[PDB]
Every structure is written in structure tokens, then in C-alpha cells.
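Re: your question from the hallway

Yes, I did run it. Sequences:
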Amino acid sequence: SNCGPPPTLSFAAPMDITLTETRFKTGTTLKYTCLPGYVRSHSTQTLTCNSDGEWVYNTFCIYKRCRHPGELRNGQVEIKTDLSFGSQIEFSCSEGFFLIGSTTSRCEVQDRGVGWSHPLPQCEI
Amino acid sequence: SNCGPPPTLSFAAPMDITLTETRFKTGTTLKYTCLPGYVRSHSTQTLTCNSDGEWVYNTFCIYKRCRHPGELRNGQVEIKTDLSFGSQIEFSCSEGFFLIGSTTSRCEVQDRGVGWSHPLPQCEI
Amino acid sequence: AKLSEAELHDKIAALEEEKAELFEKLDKVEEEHK
Amino acid sequence: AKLSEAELHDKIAALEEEKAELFEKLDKVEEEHK
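Structure:
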């Protein structure tokens, strides 16, 4: 009926970093908060130990998204999937131009939010 | 210090259709709900009579939006602004085809939500 | 690995109706708890 | 009268952060009212 230690979530972490007594009375509820790169998408950010001795929870976080970085002068900013954490955008230059810098950038953890890994390249000539 | 009758809002209506006693003690709060075509965008859907004898409120509703109606076989569905209540989309057919039906459709009140005023045309020949 | 098909628009609509649902939940909880 | 410039994407992000803010408001109200 009782739980062992909770499973680790890829999207959130426990709020108290307490002793984590390896055993928990049935009915215990543990509070979580979103990891960097994630934002809350549900009202209940808990894990609860049910009568079967198992931890129950929803995926209560989703990816943060980066702001669109704007236009590339004489080139193109291409979205491949979206601007969410982990996603990549691609850069190219128009016919009469050379691309100097990176052809890609990725939404990554930055500060306490999310930002682009690489600066926009330049299209020159 | 006291209020007269509240102004009519274009986006919401009072909840009780009571006598509407033309005068209201300062501090009175009146509850509102969104009109057809609108959805709630704020937690406080009230008008309140302040100490100056004036009704105070936020725009607590926004437009409902219609679902995208999908593709036009051998033609094109063009969004002009968005798919919000009051907005219009446009239809055209590819070179070898005649458009039979309407060249436009509009997001309008339908049932208890919002839907397209005109059915998709056909592209024929 | 598929670019959102401009159904960006449908997603925006769903997100707005879900906010509205949250707002209803918020005052329905706030009413009966008062 | 301007088509949303695929910044559909920024709007989706804002709507999601605003929902998250609602969720915080919801349990911060629900905590101290209990």
C-alpha cells in the first residue's frame, strides 16, 4: 500500500529537496515545480501515492517557447517544427550572398527562461 | 457618489435582467457574461460603481474564433486577417477551374458558438 | 518534424478557450470558497 | 487588415505563459483560502 521513492520526471523537480525518506505512507502528496525550459500546463503539479503503492501524476509541464528572432537581412529564417525548447530554426541567404556564421539556432535554457543558442548569421556581398 | 444605469457593452450583457432600478448605491457590483460571439478573457466580469458615481470595468471578453474549414479541392482558402468572430476568409480556384458558390465566408454566431456563414464553394471543370 | 501548417490559428483558438475555462474554474472555486 | 505574419508562433507562446500565470493564481488563491 505504501510507496518507495518517486520516479524522476524529465520536466519537473520536487520543491523541497528534503531527506527523501525512501518510504512514504499511502496518500502522501509531493509538490513539484517545472524544470528550466518548461512551463506549467496543469493546476495540479503533484505526485500522489495511491492505495496500490504507486505514484500517480499528470504531465503537468510543457515546453517553454523562444520568441521569434525576427528577419534575416537578405536571407531567410526557416522554422522546421516550432520555436519550443529543444527545437531548431534554419538560416539561408539569397543567391547573391554568402552566409557568415551559423546555419542553425536552437531554443535552449537561458537565464530563467529560454533563448536562442546561436546569434543570427550575416548575409554578405 | 451614486450611479445611474450602467452603459451597454458590445461584448457582454448583465446576468440577471432584473428591474434595473435606475439608481445604484456607490460600491454596487453587477455581474456580466459574454455575448454570443465572445469568450471570457479576464477573471472579473463585473461593472462596479465607484465613489465618483461612475461604472468601472475592463474589456473582459474577446472574440470567439471559428475553426479553420480545411482545404478547397483545386483551389485556395485565403485568410485575410484571422478566423475571429466578424472576420472573412476568401476562396479562389486554380487556372483550369470555375468557382461555383461564394468567394467568401465569415465567422458568425452559430448555435452556442461560432461557425462559417457560407459553405465552401466547389472548383469545377 | 512537420512545420505547423498555419494551424497556428486553430491552436490559438483552443488556447483562448482553455484560458476561458480556467477563468470559470477560478471564480467557481473562489465563489464557493467564500 | 493584415494577415497574422506567422507570429501566430509568438501569440501561442504568450497564450501558454498566460495560462501558466492563471494556474499559479488558481492555487495561490486555493492555498490561502484553505
